[PDB]
Amino acid sequence: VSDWVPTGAVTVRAPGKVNLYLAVGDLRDDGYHELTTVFHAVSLADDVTVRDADVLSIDVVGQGEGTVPTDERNLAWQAAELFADHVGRAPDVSIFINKDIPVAGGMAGGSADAAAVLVAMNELWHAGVPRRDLHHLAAQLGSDVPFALHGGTALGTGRGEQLATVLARNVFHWVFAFADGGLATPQVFKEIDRLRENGDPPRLAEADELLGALAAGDARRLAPLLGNELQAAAVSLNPELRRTLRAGESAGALAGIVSGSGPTCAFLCTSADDAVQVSAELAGAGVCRTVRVASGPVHGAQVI
Numbered sequence: 001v002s003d004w005v006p007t008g009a010v011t012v013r014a015p016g017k018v019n020l021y022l023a024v025g026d027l028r029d030d031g032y033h034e035l036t037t038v039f040h041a042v043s044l045a046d047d048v049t050v051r052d053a054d055v056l057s058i059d060v061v062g063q064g065e066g067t068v069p070t071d072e073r074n075l076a077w078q079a080a081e082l083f084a085d086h087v088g089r090a091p092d093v094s095i096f097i098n099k100d101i102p103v104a105g106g107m108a109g110g111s112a113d114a115a116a117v118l119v120a121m122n123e124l125w126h127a128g129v130p131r132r133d134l135h136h137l138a139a140q141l142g143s144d145v146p147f148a149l150h151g152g153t154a155l156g157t158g159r160g161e162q163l164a165t166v167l168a169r170n171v172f173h174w175v176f177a178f179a180d181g182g183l184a185t186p187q188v189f190k191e192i193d194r195l196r197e198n199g200d201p202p203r204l205a206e207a208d209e210l211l212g213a214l215a216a217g218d219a220r221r222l223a224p225l226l227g228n229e230l231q232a233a234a235v236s237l238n239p240e241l242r243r244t245l246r247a248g249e250s251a252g253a254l255a256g257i258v259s260g261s262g263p264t265c266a267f268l269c270t271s272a273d274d275a276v277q278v279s280a281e282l283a284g285a286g287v288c289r290t291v292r293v294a295s296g297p298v299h300g301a302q303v304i
Ligand SMILES: Nc1ncnc2c1ncn2[C@@H]1O[C@H](COP(=O)(O)OP(=O)(O)OP(=O)(O)O)[C@@H](O)[C@H]1O
Pocket: 064, 068, 069, 073, 074, 075, 076, 097, 102, 103, 104, 105, 106, 107, 108, 109, 110, 111, 113, 114, 144, 183, 185, 260, 261, 262
């Protein structure tokens, strides 16, 4: 009820994600890695207000306010052009991004932004583009965009774009530790390739047991099953992340893991109150930039 919702605008919330499970396979023909991941959408979201305008524009507040490009480099720019081309219209809209999702943090914030734009423009124009086509467009924009449309909890395969919804039969309570800087996703995938050239480090087991924990609604069962094969790459590049993980664990978290390609650390807690406690101890531990509490699963990109 603090969202920017001027008359004639359409405002869409799209959530950040954490990978509860991320197995990384072979580098494909197309230059991407085959993935098996369980995506999970959390209450740390971006809020995107789109309006008809005389030209395409982007403005950003919140996370990355100084920082995030507002020209063609922005994934929301690309999304606006793509959606407009799909519907046979010029991308004549102003896009305002109120960001809580960290920049370059492994929570797919730009992908949330791009997904929101698709949904917002469809509604703003009453363009009638069905969910399956919005999904195809999202897939063109990037691997994490379709999940940002989809929300909830989901098994991503292929590059991450092919989604099968899974049951997460509870509210799960999270603490996120935002890092001092960011990591470039391509560098983290390159780094896992490099770590596998050097040795044969351990791979995750099948997702079966983790999926069963999720379907049971059981955070304590789930915690030790969480895992992310990019975590070794992210900690290779940012060694300090081990201190962050150790601190959140020692603060009371059931489990900590790097989210995605990092450097955000995610901490699964047993209750809301437990996360209150863990987040406080962690902010005073001197190990990360800033801390958040969040819950999941939440809905995918949705008109507010
Ligand atoms: N709307 C946006 N929000 C944040 N970063 C953006 C956006 N558009 C383009 N970027 C650029 O993309 C990179 C960061 O993207 P993002 O913040 O989505 O990383 P991420 O959240 O780690 O992505 P993923 O976890 O899906 O790989 C930076 O190079 C940044 O300049």
